[PDB]
Chains A and B, each alone.
Chain A
Amino acid sequence: DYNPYLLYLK
């Protein structure tokens, strides 16, 4: 599943 909020982890 794509989840753009996960970019904030990097």
Chain B
Amino acid sequence: SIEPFLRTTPRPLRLPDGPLCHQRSKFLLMDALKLSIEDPSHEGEGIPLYDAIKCMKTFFGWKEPNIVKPHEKGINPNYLMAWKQVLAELQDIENEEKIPRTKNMKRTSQLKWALGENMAPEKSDEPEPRSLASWVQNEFNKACELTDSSWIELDEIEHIASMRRNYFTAEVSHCRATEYIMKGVYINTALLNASCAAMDDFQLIPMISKCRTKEGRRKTNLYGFIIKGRSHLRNDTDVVNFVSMEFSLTDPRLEPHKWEKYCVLEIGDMLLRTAIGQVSRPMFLYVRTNGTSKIKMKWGMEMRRCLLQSLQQIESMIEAESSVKEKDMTKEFFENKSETWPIGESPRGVEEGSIGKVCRTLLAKSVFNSLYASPQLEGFSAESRKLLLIVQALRDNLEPGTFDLGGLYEAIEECLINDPWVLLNASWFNSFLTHALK
């Protein structure tokens, strides 16, 4: 071997300095708030706008809306007028005997500003470097956590595979990341179908999900509304602009950097339980202009793929330790809950976790790869894998070739600009690296 002082120790990835990064998801994640109704037995899927109105009637604290956090780069009265127009159009729907399957809105000056002007019938890019904000890790943690509700539905009614899918499903059915899959499937289905069927119209689209309570009873959830803009989507890259209007209890003043793209309205008073007792807290509406494409909407409609792809990664882990002990450990892993995995960290060091925590962490990572999909992620993922293989080989005292390590770091650090998800993944790599070559 070469003298120890000549051996190359991989340095940390360098993250760029700059203003804290902002939320760029297509919908709210940890900050969402659901207005919900309990579905009739044998219901099925209702008329979305009928479910939307029923969900809104379960809230008793509606009040005159006001701007409480301006969008710095927006015309804030247009956001306030847009919300008042959604309420006026829902009232017009309520006043008709028959609730329609879709609703075309009046193309007012406020919506034209937010979405764009009429056009004749046919014959991410943000460049500045941003620093990693604490909210990204916090979002990821919330995605890994369990909800009171089940998000995966049973089907119509080989020992290993069946037992594995069932063990995995039991661990992730209540997982917040599973809520994000079903929320994403529903809204991308509604937006793509509307984009194809009503190319010129501004359609009012409820943001809906369904789940089952602890009591096995069916719930319909309303997160808010999207207004679709003009949608002549010829190629799969063509952008449809939309306005998102999303319920929340989050005070936007806590993390102003997170909410740079949004106008926040105060729309209601919510009665909340606290240790001391009952308190009135504001219900907010998070409003922004955003955009998506046929290909992104198709990916969103496919988000149940995250469940198969994360099950695959768990299967491989049970396969490796089933070889060594020459006895398939499936039952023992999910049953014993005695075997642990390094899955978390604190200032105190690495935190070991149950197989359940591993199932939910890998699902959350797959789902965040989909919600925050980007070219920078594809580059970071390919190049970072090459570095991880060198670190594993060094950790095992194998002396891998380091002569081109310089060119590998350049290719990875090229991907670290301003994407909140890629910057978190880079930070995660750094933490692993400090523990790997201790």
Please give the residue numbers on chain A whose beta carbons come within 8 Å of chain B beta carbons, in ascending order.
Answer: 1-10
Question: Does B131 count as interface, using CB distance less than 8 angstroms?
Answer: no
Contact B342 A9 (CB under 8 A): yes
The binding surface of chain B is classed by DSSP as: helix
| B425: chain A residues within 8 A (beta carbon) | 5
Contact B141 A8 (CB under 8 A): no
A-B CB contact pairs (8 Å), 13 listed: A1-B137, A1-B344, A3-B432, A4-B343, A5-B388, A5-B428, A5-B429, A6-B345, A6-B432, A7-B343, A8-B391, A9-B342, A9-B435
| A6: chain B residues within 8 A (beta carbon) | 342-345, 350, 431-432, 435
| A4: chain B residues within 8 A (beta carbon) | 343, 361-362, 364-365, 428
| A2: chain B residues within 8 A (beta carbon) | 140-141, 144, 343-344, 357, 361, 364
Once the chains are docked, how many angstroms separate the CA of A7 from the CA of B365?
13
Query: A7-B342, A8-B391 given. 6 additional CB < 8 A pairs?
Result: A1-B345, A2-B141, A4-B343, A6-B342, A8-B388, A10-B341
Min CB–CB distance B36 → chain A (angstroms): 27
Once the chains are docked, how many angstroms separate the CA of A8 from the CA of B431?
12
The binding surface of chain A is classed by DSSP as: helix
B 328-372 to A, binary, CB cutoff 8 A, 1 in contact else 0: 000000000000011111100010000001100110110000000
Name the residue on B nearest A6 (C-beta). B342
Question: Does B197 count as interface, using CB distance less than 8 angstroms?
Answer: no
Once the chains are docked, how many angstroms separate the CA of A3 from the CA of B277?
36
Contact A3 B144 (CB under 8 A): no
| A1: chain B residues within 8 A (beta carbon) | 137, 140-141, 344-346
Once the chains are docked, how many angstroms separate the CA of A6 from the CA of B435?
8
B 239-264 to A, binary, CB cutoff 8 A, 1 in contact else 0: 00000000000000000000000000
Min CB–CB distance A3 → chain B (angstroms): 5
Contact B141 A9 (CB under 8 A): no
Question: Does B436 count as interface, using CB distance less than 8 angstroms?
Answer: yes
Min CB–CB distance B385 → chain A (angstroms): 11
7 tightest A-B contacts by CB? A5-B432, A6-B342, A2-B144, A5-B428, A9-B342, A4-B365, A3-B428
Question: Does B322 count as interface, using CB distance less than 8 angstroms?
Answer: no
Contact A5 B341 (CB under 8 A): no
Once the chains are docked, how many angstroms separate the CA of A9 from the CA of B373?
26
Question: Does B402 count as interface, using CB distance less than 8 angstroms?
Answer: no
Question: Does B312 count as interface, using CB distance less than 8 angstroms?
Answer: no
Contact B137 A8 (CB under 8 A): no
Question: Does B392 count as interface, using CB distance less than 8 angstroms?
Answer: yes
| A3: chain B residues within 8 A (beta carbon) | 343-345, 428, 431-432
Once the chains are docked, how many angstroms separate the CA of A4 from the CA of B350?
11
| A9: chain B residues within 8 A (beta carbon) | 342, 350, 432, 435-436
Once the chains are docked, how many angstroms separate the CA of A6 from the CA of B425?
12
| A10: chain B residues within 8 A (beta carbon) | 341-342
Once the chains are docked, how many angstroms separate the CA of A6 from the CA of B358?
11
Name the residue on A nearest B392 (C-beta). A8
Min CB–CB distance A2 → chain B (angstroms): 5
Min CB–CB distance A9 → chain B (angstroms): 5
| B345: chain A residues within 8 A (beta carbon) | 1, 3, 6
| A5: chain B residues within 8 A (beta carbon) | 388, 425, 428-429, 431-432
Min CB–CB distance B205 → chain A (angstroms): 32
Once the chains are docked, how many angstroms separate the CA of A6 from the CA of B144?
15
Once the chains are docked, how many angstroms separate the CA of A1 from the CA of B361?
11
Contact A8 B144 (CB under 8 A): no
Min CB–CB distance A5 → chain B (angstroms): 4
Min CB–CB distance B435 → chain A (angstroms): 6
Name the residue on A nearest B360 (C-beta). A2
Contact A8 B432 (CB under 8 A): yes
Once the chains are docked, how many angstroms separate the CA of A5 from the CA of B364?
13
| A7: chain B residues within 8 A (beta carbon) | 341-343, 358, 361
| B342: chain A residues within 8 A (beta carbon) | 6-7, 9-10
Once the chains are docked, how many angstroms separate the CA of A9 from the CA of B395?
9
Name the residue on A nearest B141 (C-beta). A2
Once the chains are docked, how many angstroms separate the CA of A6 from the CA of B212?
33
